Amino acid sequence: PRAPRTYSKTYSTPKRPYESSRLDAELKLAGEFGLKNKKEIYRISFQLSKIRRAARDLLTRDEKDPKRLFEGNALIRRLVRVGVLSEDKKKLDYVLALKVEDFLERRLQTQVYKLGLAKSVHHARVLITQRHIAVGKQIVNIPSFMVRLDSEKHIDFAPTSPFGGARPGRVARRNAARKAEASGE
Amino acid sequence: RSQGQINAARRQGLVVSVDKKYGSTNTRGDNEGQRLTKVDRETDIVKPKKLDPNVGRAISRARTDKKMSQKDLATKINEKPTVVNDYEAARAIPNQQVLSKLERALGVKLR
Amino acid sequence: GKGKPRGLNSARKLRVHRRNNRWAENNYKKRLLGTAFKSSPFGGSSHAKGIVLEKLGIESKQPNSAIRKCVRVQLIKNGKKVTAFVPNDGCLNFVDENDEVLLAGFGRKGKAKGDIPGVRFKVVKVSGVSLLALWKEKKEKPRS
Amino acid sequence: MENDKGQLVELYVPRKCSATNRIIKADDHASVQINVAKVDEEGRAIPGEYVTYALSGYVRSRGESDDSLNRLAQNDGLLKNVWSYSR
């Protein structure tokens, strides 16, 4: 009798289960991006299929429809802000050409790797979830953070993390401890 | 080959050698797949890796006279008990995968 | 043309004609006759518990020549007697008379499966544990 | 057919039958391109200067190819009192 909590699922399983085209198209999306499983790839195509349904709905409507104009710019400026639509590609005919590749680029698990400091795309994944990377002032350990356009200057090591200073962690701290009790005294 | 450069050469380029392999995934390796063309285009007879002169004689005893039988030995390397039979003295064309499992299952370091 | 009415004031004829021809459909009839409640051995349920009465051997139909090792079971909630197949080998040793088995459908929604003639059910649990566990020696049948 | 900037697309524009105004497809092998010589004083058909008619393979199969050229050439002055409008 308390009001319900809305919830939804954020992915979709493909219709035909065993392909050789789709199953091997995961070469890029799992080895070249360093991903857990196919649900991280099914998640992206779900949002991307959610985008085209709204865009197809708008294109059917008349040009200079106030509904087309309002939700059109809103859909563009949301996709511009996260950096999946390029700086001037801003047209509803180009959000339909938007593919799965330039969503995984904007993930923080790759944006760490492209901005140096990671030396592997799934060395970055380990560093993120080990509470090392902070955006602005906030530590994030979610590898699917989907950074914005005014945020790439703010991926840096955390003020708490050992690689951002602040008294290195329990491995080196204990390792220096046993040389203190063996060599120091 | 194996992690020597395939991560070091992937510094923000992410595509050099990303093509698909031959594609069996349970059929054995292509260690003679190069030699298979050479015996196909050369219009004469060529000798196929003739014999096993001392890797037969010496390593049959070190493997099998120790404890084991070929019916046992071929069962742990997963080959028919006549395959090991023709690796005993002579009369085989030695391929790499069978001779590798022969080595790692019974230790004697003769290739 | 086309044998059906087309006039704009003819929705009643099309609606009653669709209704009469729905009865030729196999599952529409069973949904609206309640055949699952009255006629099916399970009372329109996925599963039912039973009581084992006898071990049966049923000859497999052509072109197979095996003996299928099933049992005869009487249900609790209905009292009806059904024949249920006992899966992969050694499980007929794990089942005995009066073990209070649990039954499921045999895959084909009320039809026989494979070369077994006239068996629409299979045993899932015996004595309340499993058959997978007993077959894989993961659990033990209670002493009864 | 063109894009927004007027640049032409549709890699070829097909011929059309001069009798029934229908597209000659790339696989209409019964279609025919009739070439008729142009003439001047004292005969002497000029080489390489034509009067051209295209007939689709539909028309020729129907048997209308003769009656079509009688109309198609009388209206161009190639004939007189051969084709009549009123049947």
Next chain:
Amino acid sequence: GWVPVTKLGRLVKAGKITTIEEIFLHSLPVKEFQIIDTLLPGLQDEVMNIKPVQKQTRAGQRTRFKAVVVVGDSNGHVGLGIKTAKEVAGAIRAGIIIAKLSVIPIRRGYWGTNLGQPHSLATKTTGKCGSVTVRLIPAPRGSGIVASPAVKKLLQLAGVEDVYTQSNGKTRTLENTLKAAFVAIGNTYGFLTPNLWAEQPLPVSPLDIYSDEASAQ
């Protein structure tokens, strides 16, 4: 290498005809495949089905292998050829030759406002071959080819970016479905849109201009 026997073959070998749209505009019957190897290079092929057909005899069964192959470069041109032969290898080689000679143009268009380089078909087109009808519907941008994995694979080589399909009949007969889709895309230039209402001056055939190069010596 290639000694042409056809008048059209001589003009292509002599370089007097340099585009295949010259053949398609004049409906010229292509009789030898080396015409359109030197006129549409970079035209890949792929074999879509190998299945056996048998004729029974007094002594035994006569089995031989039917091959369905499709060709198309990636832009505007499609070819479908079917051939049976005693060997699988020979049927694929001979099927490719038949596939090339049946190359046709597809007409591509816009589902909506035209923003260059058409992605979809110009019209709704259907094609039937032996109880299998394949309908092709224009689709908005970003839809892709929505088709069966064999029919989609023929429209990939066609050059169609976005298209819908319906289907009917026994589509598990793979030969009749591909033949029905081949008819459906070949009818794209069959349909006369209002773009094409304008009159044209009926150009002169290259076999009729370059007559003494085509003629044998």
Next chain:
RNA sequence: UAAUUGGAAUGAGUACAAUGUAAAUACCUUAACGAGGAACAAUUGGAGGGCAAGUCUGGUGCCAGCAGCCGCGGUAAUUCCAGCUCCAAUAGCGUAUAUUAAAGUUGUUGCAGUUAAAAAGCUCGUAGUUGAACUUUGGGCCCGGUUGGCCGGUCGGAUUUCCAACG
């Protein structure tokens, strides 16, 4: 085909505290401990086709069993029981029943009825469904013609403009 080695990082957990809370638990913080194959060890179903992945080995011998379907097994089993290897999804995966898509196999869109299932033996006939044609054009401005002439330029036809209205 691994196979021997190194320093780095971390939380799952154990917890001073504080925070949280009506009081607690838990989360979010955080002192102190907390990783080297023995563990702090991921499973669930599959490997003939549909359908991705072994014609590798041992056992059985139309037996045991598998198998949604086609099929496998009668002494060289790619299909059973195993070992190895591999595939699929993954903290989830299989099984059963129902239901929706598939299904243009319920068809208004949109089925089929000569021979595959299906045109009442034939005709009349009420409800129902369906039913030939016919009854006048006021605002202004830009565009195309079709008639009407002021206009021929010209060796019976050749361009159109200013003006009606003619829709």
